[PDB]
C-alpha cells in the first residue's frame, strides 16, 4: 500500500524548518551533516508519531466501545 | 516502451472492388485466449497522494518535540 510514504511527506512538511534549525545549531555551515541529522530526525519523528497516533485512535475506539473491551 | 506497430493484409476477390463499405472479415491471429488483463495497463506517478494534512498535526507536534529534545542528550549530556 506504501501508506507510510504520504505520512513521511506530511511530517516532513510541518517539521522541515524545525529540523533545519536544530541541524544548523549542531552542524552550522555543513549542509551535508545537516541533512544527515535531518534524516535521522525524520524517521525518529515518524516512529514516535505512529506509536503515539495509534494510541490516540485507539483511545477514541475504546471510548466508542465502552464495553470493557 | 510506448511501441506502436501497424500492419495490413487484404484478402478479397480479384475484381478490385472499391467504394462500398467493407464489412465481415474479422480474422486476426490467436495463440489462445486473449487473457483478461486489459491493454496499456500503465499509469504515471503524479504523487498527488497526501493532500493538505493527511496527519494529526498535534500528535506530530508532540512527537517531533520529544525527538528533538531527546536526541540532544544522545549527542552528549555535557551540555544541558
Amino acid at each position: 500500500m506504501q501508506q507510510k510514504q504520504q505520512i513521511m511527506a506530511a511530517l516532513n512538511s510541518q517539521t522541515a524548518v524545525q529540523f533545519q534549525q536544530y541541524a544548523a545549531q549542531q552542524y552550522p555551515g555543513n549542509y551535508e551533516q545537516q541533512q544527515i541529522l535531518i534524516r535521522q530526525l525524520q524517521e525518529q519523528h515518524y516512529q514516535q508519531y505512529m506509536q503515539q497516533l495509534y494510541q490516540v485512535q485507539l483511545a477514541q475506539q475504546q471510548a466508542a466501545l465502552q464495553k470493557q473491551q | 516502451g510506448a511501441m506502436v506497430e501497424a500492419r495490413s493484409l487484404a484478402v478479397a476477390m480479384g475484381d478490385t472492388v472499391v467504394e462500398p463499405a467493407p464489412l465481415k472479415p474479422t480474422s486476426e491471429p490467436t495463440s489462445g485466449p486473449p487473457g483478461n488483463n486489459g491493454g496499456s495497463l500503465l499509469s504515471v506517478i503524479t504523487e498527488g497522494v497526501g493532500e493538505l494534512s493527511v496527519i494529526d498535526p498535534e500528535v506530530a507536534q508532540k512527537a517531533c518535540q520529544e525527538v528533538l529534545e531527546k536526541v540532544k542528550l544522545l549527542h552528549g549530556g555535557v551540555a544541558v
Side-chain angles (χ1 to χ4, degrees):
Chain A
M1 291 299 182
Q2 292 278 48
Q3 60 178 287
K4 172 176 177 180
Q5 308 305 339
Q6 69 209 77
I7 312 303
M8 307 309 285
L11 295 192
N12 291 347
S13 294
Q14 73 172 75
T15 59
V17 65
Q18 308 194 58
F19 293 169
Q20 275 177 105
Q21 285 169 300
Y22 177 49
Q25 202 178 20
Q26 296 304 124
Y27 310 112
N30 296 330
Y31 63 97
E32 55 202 296
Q33 258 308 128
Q34 281 172 28
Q35 290 291 314
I36 296 159
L37 177 55
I38 291 162
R39 291 201 70 84
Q40 299 304 311
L41 292 168
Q42 288 174 332
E43 176 126 67
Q44 287 175 70
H45 177 201
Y46 173 83
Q47 291 174 297
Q48 179 60 27
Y49 170 79
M50 186 50 57
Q51 289 171 238
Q52 194 184 324
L53 177 71
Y54 189 100
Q55 295 173 76
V56 181
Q57 64 83 45
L58 171 60
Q60 294 175 19
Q61 190 179 77
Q62 295 284 55
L65 256 292
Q66 296 281 55
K67 235 176 185 66
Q68 300 179 282
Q69 179 68 77
Chain B
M3 64 176 284
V4 179
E5 189 183 3
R7 298 179 186 172
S8 303
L9 190 285
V11 46
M13 62 185 84
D15 197 44
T16 58
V17 181
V18 62
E19 195 178 66
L23 62 108
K24 202 185 295 183
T26 30
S27 183
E28 280 297 313
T30 171
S31 59
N36 190 39
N37 300 64
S40 306
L41 221 307
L42 300 174
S43 57
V44 180
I45 301 105
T46 62
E47 214 155 295
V49 184
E51 296 180 296
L52 189 63
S53 299
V54 70
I55 54 167
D56 285 56
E58 305 192 346
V59 177
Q61 192 284 309
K62 298 298 178 188
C64 65
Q65 174 64 52
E66 289 200 64
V67 169
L68 285 167
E69 75 190 21
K70 268 86 187 178
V71 73
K72 281 171 184 180
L73 295 173
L74 300 177
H75 282 196
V78 214
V80 185

